[PDB]
Amino acid sequence: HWGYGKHNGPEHWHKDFPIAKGERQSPVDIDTHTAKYDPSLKPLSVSYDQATSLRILNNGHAFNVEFDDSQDKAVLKGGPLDGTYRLIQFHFHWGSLDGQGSEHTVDKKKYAAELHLVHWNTKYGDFGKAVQQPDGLAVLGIFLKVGSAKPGLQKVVDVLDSIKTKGKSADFTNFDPRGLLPESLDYWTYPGSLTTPPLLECVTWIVLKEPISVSSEQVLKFRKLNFNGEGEPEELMVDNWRPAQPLKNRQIKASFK
Numbered sequence: 001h002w003g004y005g006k007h008n009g010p011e012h013w014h015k016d017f018p019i020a021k022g023e024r025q026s027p028v029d030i031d032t033h034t035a036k037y038d039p040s041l042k043p044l045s046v047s048y049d050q051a052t053s054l055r056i057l058n059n060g061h062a063f064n065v066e067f068d069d070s071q072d073k074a075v076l077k078g079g080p081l082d083g084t085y086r087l088i089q090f091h092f093h094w095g096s097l098d099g100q101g102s103e104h105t106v107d108k109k110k111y112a113a114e115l116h117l118v119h120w121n122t123k124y125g126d127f128g129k130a131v132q133q134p135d136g137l138a139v140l141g142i143f144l145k146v147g148s149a150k151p152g153l154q155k156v157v158d159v160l161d162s163i164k165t166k167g168k169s170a171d172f173t174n175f176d177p178r179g180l181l182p183e184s185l186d187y188w189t190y191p192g193s194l195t196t197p198p199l200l201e202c203v204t205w206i207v208l209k210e211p212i213s214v215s216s217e218q219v220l221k222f223r224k225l226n227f228n229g230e231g232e233p234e235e236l237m238v239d240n241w242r243p244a245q246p247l248k249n250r251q252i253k254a255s256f257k
């Protein structure tokens with residue numbers, strides 16, 4: 001099936017998933033001098049106080065930390081968003097080298113990794129229904145640069161040894177996603193898509209301007225994960241990012257000047 005290698009990577013996805021060449025694909029390059037400040041945007045509201053993490057899973061494409069989304073325990077509201085969006089999981093995309101790994105770019109700059117906190121619009125009842133709607137998901141994206149260690153990320157790093165290969169999961173309760181946010185919630189926003197198959201065009205992207213810093217030791221541990229399953233030849237999980245796609249008929253709005 002699909003992946004990030006030469007023979008199954010992003011250049012190939014359009015054959016099984018023709019929407020890959022669609023009207024509102026993600027990621028994109030964020031040209032900071034083309035985005036328009038929108039003073040009508042309301043303040044972004046990240047409400048993660050009652051967040052309940054459950055488990056961490058390597059699915060052969062990335063790893064995610066899952067959350068109990070059976071109630072409004074951890075939600076994103078405000079900004080360009082109408083209504084309430086519930087946190088279902090977060091995951092990362094990263095590179096083989098510190099100079100690449102993010103999906104979105106900023107004035108063509110690539111970051112070492114990108115964190116995606118995925119939320120679904122509660123008006124649609126469940127995640128599966130939400131992805132079939134043009135306003136079904138809100139994904140909060142945070143760039144990672146290599147610098148000083150991020151204490152709030154270490155508990156995630158600590159557990160990667162236990163989910164090295166495809167299909168492995170481990171208990172991951174009592175994790176606080178608030179520890180992964182930068183100080184500022186300044187952001188750019190645009191309508192886009194999931195960045196992996198099925199590439200559905202159901203996402204309002206909210207990408208924060210301020211990156212978080214993580215240590216080289218922390219990112220190195222991301223790079224020891226495996227795309228392959230247990231007992232198979234080792235393929236390091238690296239460069240699991242889709243490159244920037246054409247902006248086409250879309251406008252990126254900024255929450256700040």
Ligand SMILES: CCC(=O)O[C@@H]1[C@@H](OC(=O)CC)[C@@H](O)O[C@H](COS(N)(=O)=O)[C@H]1OC(=O)CC
Nearest residue numbers: 057059061062063064091116139193194195196
């Ligand atoms: C089980 C959840 C899932 O596979 O998440 C997917 C995620 O992987 C991880 O979370 C590792 C387990 C990853 O490849 O990113 C895409 C793309 O998400 S993104 N980058 O657009 O935010 C997600 O795809 C989806 O969320 C929809 C199927």
Ligand SMILES: [Zn+2]
Nearest residue numbers: 091093116195
């Ligand atoms: Zn993602």
